[PDB]
Amino acid sequence: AEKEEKRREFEAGVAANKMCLDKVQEVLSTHQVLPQNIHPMR
Amino acid sequence: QFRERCEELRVELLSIHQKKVCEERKAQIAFNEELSRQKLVEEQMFSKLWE
Amino acid sequence: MRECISIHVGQAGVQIGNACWELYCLEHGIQPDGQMPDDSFNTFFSETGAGKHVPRAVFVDLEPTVIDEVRTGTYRQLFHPEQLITGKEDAANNYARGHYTIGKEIIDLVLDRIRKLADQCTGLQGFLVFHSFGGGTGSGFTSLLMERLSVDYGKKSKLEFSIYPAPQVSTAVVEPYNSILTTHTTLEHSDCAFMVDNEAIYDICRRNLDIERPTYTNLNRLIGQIVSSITASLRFDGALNVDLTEFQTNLVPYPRIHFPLATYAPVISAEKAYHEQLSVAEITNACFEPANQMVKCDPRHGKYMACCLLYRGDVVPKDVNAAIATIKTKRTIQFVDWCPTGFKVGINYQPPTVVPGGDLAKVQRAVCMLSNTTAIAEAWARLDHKFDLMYAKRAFVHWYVGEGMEEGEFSEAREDMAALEKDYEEVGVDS
Amino acid sequence: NSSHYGEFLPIPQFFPCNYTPKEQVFSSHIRATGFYQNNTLNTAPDRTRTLDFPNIQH
Amino acid sequence: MREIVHLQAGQCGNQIGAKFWEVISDEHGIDPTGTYHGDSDLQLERINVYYNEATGGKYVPRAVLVDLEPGTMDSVRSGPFGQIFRPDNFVFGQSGAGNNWAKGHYTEGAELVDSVLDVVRKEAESCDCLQGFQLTHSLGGGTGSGMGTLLISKIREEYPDRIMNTFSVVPSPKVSDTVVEPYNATLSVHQLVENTDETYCIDNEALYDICFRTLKLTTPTYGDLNHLVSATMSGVTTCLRFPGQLNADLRKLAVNMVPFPRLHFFMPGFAPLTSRGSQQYRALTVPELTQQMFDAKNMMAACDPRHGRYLTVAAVFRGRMSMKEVDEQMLNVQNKNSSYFVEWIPNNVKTAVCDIPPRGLKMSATFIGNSTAIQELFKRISEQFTAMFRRKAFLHWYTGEGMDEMEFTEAESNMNDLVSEYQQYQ
Numbered sequence A: 001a002e003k004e005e006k007r008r009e010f011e012a013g014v015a016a017n018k019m020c021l022d023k024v025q026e027v028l029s030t031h032q033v034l035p036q037n038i039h040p041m042r
Numbered sequence B: 001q002f003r004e005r006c007e008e009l010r011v012e013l014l015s016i017h018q019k020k021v022c023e024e025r026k027a028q029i030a031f032n033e034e035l036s037r038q039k040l041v042e043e044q045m046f047s048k049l050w051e
Numbered sequence C: 001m002r003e004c005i006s007i008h009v010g011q012a013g014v015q016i017g018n019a020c021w022e023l024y025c026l027e028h029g030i031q032p033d034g035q036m037p038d039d040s041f042n043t044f045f046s047e048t049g050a051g052k053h054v055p056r057a058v059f060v061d062l063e064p065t066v067i068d069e070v071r072t073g074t075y076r077q078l079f080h081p082e083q084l085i086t087g088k089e090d091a092a093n094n095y096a097r098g099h100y101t102i103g104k105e106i107i108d109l110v111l112d113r114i115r116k117l118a119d120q121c122t123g124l125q126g127f128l129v130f131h132s133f134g135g136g137t138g139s140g141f142t143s144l145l146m147e148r149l150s151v152d153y154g155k156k157s158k159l160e161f162s163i164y165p166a167p168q169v170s171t172a173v174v175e176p177y178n179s180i181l182t183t184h185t186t187l188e189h190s191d192c193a194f195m196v197d198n199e200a201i202y203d204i205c206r207r208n209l210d211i212e213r214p215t216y217t218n219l220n221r222l223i224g225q226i227v228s229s230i231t232a233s234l235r236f237d238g239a240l241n242v243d244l245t246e247f248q249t250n251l252v253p254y255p256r257i258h259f260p261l262a263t264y265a266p267v268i269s270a271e272k273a274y275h276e277q278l279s280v281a282e283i284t285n286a287c288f289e290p291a292n293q294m295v296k297c298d299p300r301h302g303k304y305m306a307c308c309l310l311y312r313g314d315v316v317p318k319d320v321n322a323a324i325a326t327i328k329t330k331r332t333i334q335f336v337d338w339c340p341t342g343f344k345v346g347i348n349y350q351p352p353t354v355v356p357g358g359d360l361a362k363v364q365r366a367v368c369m370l371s372n373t374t375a376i377a378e379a380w381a382r383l384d385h386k387f388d389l390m391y392a393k394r395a396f397v398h399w400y401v402g403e404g405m406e407e408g409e410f411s412e413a414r415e416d417m418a419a420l421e422k423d424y425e426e427v428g429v430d431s
Numbered sequence D: 001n002s003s004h005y006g007e008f009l010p011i012p013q014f015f016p017c018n019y020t021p022k023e024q025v026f027s028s029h030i031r032a033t034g035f036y037q038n039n040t041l042n043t044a045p046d047r048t049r050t051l052d053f054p055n056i057q058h
Numbered sequence E: 001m002r003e004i005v006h007l008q009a010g011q012c013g014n015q016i017g018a019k020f021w022e023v024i025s026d027e028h029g030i031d032p033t034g035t036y037h038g039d040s041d042l043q044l045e046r047i048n049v050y051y052n053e054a055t056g057g058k059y060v061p062r063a064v065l066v067d068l069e070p071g072t073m074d075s076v077r078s079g080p081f082g083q084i085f086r087p088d089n090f091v092f093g094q095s096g097a098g099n100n101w102a103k104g105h106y107t108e109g110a111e112l113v114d115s116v117l118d119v120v121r122k123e124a125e126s127c128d129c130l131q132g133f134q135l136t137h138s139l140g141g142g143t144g145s146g147m148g149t150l151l152i153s154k155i156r157e158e159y160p161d162r163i164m165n166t167f168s169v170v171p172s173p174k175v176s177d178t179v180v181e182p183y184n185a186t187l188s189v190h191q192l193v194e195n196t197d198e199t200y201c202i203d204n205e206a207l208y209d210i211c212f213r214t215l216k217l218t219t220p221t222y223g224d225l226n227h228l229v230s231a232t233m234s235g236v237t238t239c240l241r242f243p244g245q246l247n248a249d250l251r252k253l254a255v256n257m258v259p260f261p262r263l264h265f266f267m268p269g270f271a272p273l274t275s276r277g278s279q280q281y282r283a284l285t286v287p288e289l290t291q292q293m294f295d296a297k298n299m300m301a302a303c304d305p306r307h308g309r310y311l312t313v314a315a316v317f318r319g320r321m322s323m324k325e326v327d328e329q330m331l332n333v334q335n336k337n338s339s340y341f342v343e344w345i346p347n348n349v350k351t352a353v354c355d356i357p358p359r360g361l362k363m364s365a366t367f368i369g370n371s372t373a374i375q376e377l378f379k380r381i382s383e384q385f386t387a388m389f390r391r392k393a394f395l396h397w398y399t400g401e402g403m404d405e406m407e408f409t410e411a412e413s414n415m416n417d418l419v420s421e422y423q424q425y426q
């Protein structure tokens, strides 16, 4: 049971890593800028 | 806080600013050329007055 | 919250000021009417309930023929029609007329207008004074405003942008006479004073801007960029922020030495911005370059005491500190024995703006350097010879003695500056 | 000559992409109104560093 | 029970404390609003050590922020977690010190010192049994150093039988961003050495080579640097908030790290940091942890301890783990590197074990080590201070604000006394 729990932990780690790369790709694809951060005549 | 923590995002926002600057300075070149054309027609006009 | 009150005096002062205030109005989203088409404009622009932004500036001259163009230009409505002040009979390139006779009738009314501009401001960082050494109004009238400002306001910050006469060329003949009489009095009541030479602004435009023949109009844009770089820490957020009281304590080591030099880099053409790459190291070696020095003096003849660098744009502290380490490893740049660490750095996030009709390009990252160097003796020693050979026969004095100043002021000016030169050498000597 | 300073009207080309100004409304409020003042009376319960009011008996 | 009041000084302190309290908030499960969003019951058990109770089930932050320029608090409140700070705890001046230790100590710092004197006794007695205070500041400028080193002096007279932490940021020779910086550091440490309990030496040179060579990244902003410093700032006080097999509080660390009252300077370090390219190539086990713990590239200070002697070390571990392994490995490095340790203290190690790791990790550790190599920094600043002072330079900003010339002399003599005390143990 201890060995199976270790294998589960490795699988959860790689799943979280894939999730965070998908999130950085999503925030790369959609970028939102504040109107206070944009210039008034721009 | 995700945007402040990422770094590839910082790389992309460093690149896109340069991609903007290229087009800005290109149309600035176009502005400089039209000012030069204005100076040329000024010189022709003043030569006509001399004649 | 912070603010600084700028005053422009002389024909050189207002001509700089026109390119100056054009730059911030475009920088802060202000139309030439004075309106929008954040509260970051509180450093320069006041607030009116209509939403109007009156600039906190006083335009001073003794001659109305340069002020009336501002009265009839594109910026008629923006400038308040009473801050811009004018006099009569000008000064005619005289220190004595501007100090004693002609300057005394305007000095009461201007001090009302600093008073009327300082009551609104709860916290005051300092005053900026833009003037010229060569002009009579820029010499004599400025020689006692600094006296009246010191006795009115005790320890307020004072900054001077001073048109220093060029070593080779000179517009006037009594220009050395006006320069010495200012540099007799302008020591003990001025917190800082940067020297600008029109000669070195000329060859930089010839070489690094691909333009052959500029005027004063496209000349003050670079002066506007330097003072924009100084005040951009007050106006926008940055990683490292520098105020007026920060760099003045970090540059001048003695009360008698408050004359730094201000180099700017990169100064490049719009067609060459597509060719050059500009890193942090590649823009900070140009400001150390003696060819791009803004004062006609070679720092290789002297030694450095203190430096201040204002990085503006897309910069990181790693490339800054790597470049400072690279500069310190070079044997050409020499620092004094008592100063192992003579650097102070500033970071500003907002990239520089560009003006229509300007000469520069839109650059991601730039820098200006504020350095104090033991090489400006050769400029001071040069007009020391120029004054002495003009003064040898007691010439050009009936236009000064008859106005109301005695003949002992010249000899008192000469011993004061000779004391300044020997104090200047004893600082620069090694232990 | 000095008409050249503002001959050309502003164009949205000639402007930086980033514009991040300072924001001082929150700071100006807490600067205008003072940073607290003690005119209050002393009210702190008596406390012991070892135990607060044990059940000592017998 | 046991409460720590946070104190935050300077522009460097506000930038590093905002990242530090975000790190605590993820560890204890607090949303940016302030309400409790946690998946466990244990996270609320020890919450009064750093949080105060408010209405509606909100935890506010026990922390006072001091400044002289108001341009620093606006970045904090508009920043990531600035909406949780109580607005009455911010204190700022109407003008800046000007990177002058003189202005923040005598002339300008003496007016704002009354207001923070009021707010620090609004939060000191609201607890039950005050453990101690924690100051975070830097020694590079007079805003956080001039105000900080006088705020320490006044609090010690009021609260003597407590513990005082301060995380000093010592100036470095290569990242010297201020000309008058040796003047500020020498005059601050002289007041600091007499009136504090624990000091830590965070050096930006050691922050730079860690984030370049070990983390293997290209753009290290100050937010990333303040993340890695706050990992050691939070990992030291894990025993205060989380149950463990070997708990060790701040005073428990203190009484074994100070053999003498003038010996309270430490070398921090963080073990399990690894680049993302090598994270999957390395097995995270405690012999690998103590291997990476002790090499000279992980210290948060710009000293190499191979030139010095290890005075006393400790390690606070985190996560579910066995302590025969840590006792075997720490005996192994004690017996192997026998030359670098002092012989007048056998068993030079304190060991602490915490059950709960940081989020996203299963095992972690924090290093605190007192060494003789701390005099290497002090002599580097002493020669620069002597070189500047012997030519009568940069003094008109200081002797014109209420100082005689003898205070630099007594500060130089106190530093020379302090360096000579470190010399006899090498």
Ligand SMILES: Nc1nc2c(ncn2[C@@H]2O[C@H](COP(=O)(O)OP(=O)(O)OP(=O)(O)O)[C@@H](O)[C@H]2O)c(=O)[nH]1
Binding pocket: C009, C010, C011, C012, C015, C016, C062, C063, C090, C091, C092, C093, C094, C132, C134, C135, C136, C137, C138, C139, C163, C165, C171, C172, C196, C197, C198, C216, C217, C219, C220
């Ligand atoms: N760099 C720079 N210098 C200028 C500019 N305009 C005028 N000057 C300087 O001004 C000097 C000419 O005298 P002014 O300063 O204009 O004279 P004034 O201040 O009006 O004083 P009076 O003419 O006596 O009333 C020249 O030697 C220039 O060096 C300018 O636009 N840029």
Ligand SMILES: Nc1nc2c(ncn2[C@@H]2O[C@H](COP(=O)(O)OP(=O)(O)O)[C@@H](O)[C@H]2O)c(=O)[nH]1
Binding pocket: E009, E010, E011, E012, E015, E016, E099, E138, E140, E141, E142, E143, E144, E145, E169, E175, E176, E177, E178, E202, E204, E207, E222, E223, E225, E226, E229
């Ligand atoms: N580690 C760290 N160092 C910082 C940070 N911000 C500034 N510094 C350092 O602090 C020095 C300047 O300190 P300063 O802001 O003037 O301190 P203050 O005068 O008390 O506000 C610089 O050399 C920086 O390297 C930070 O967030 N983290």
Ligand SMILES: [Mg+2]
Binding pocket: C010, C011, C061, C062, C063, C090, C091, C135, C136, C137, C138
């Ligand atoms: Mg004039």
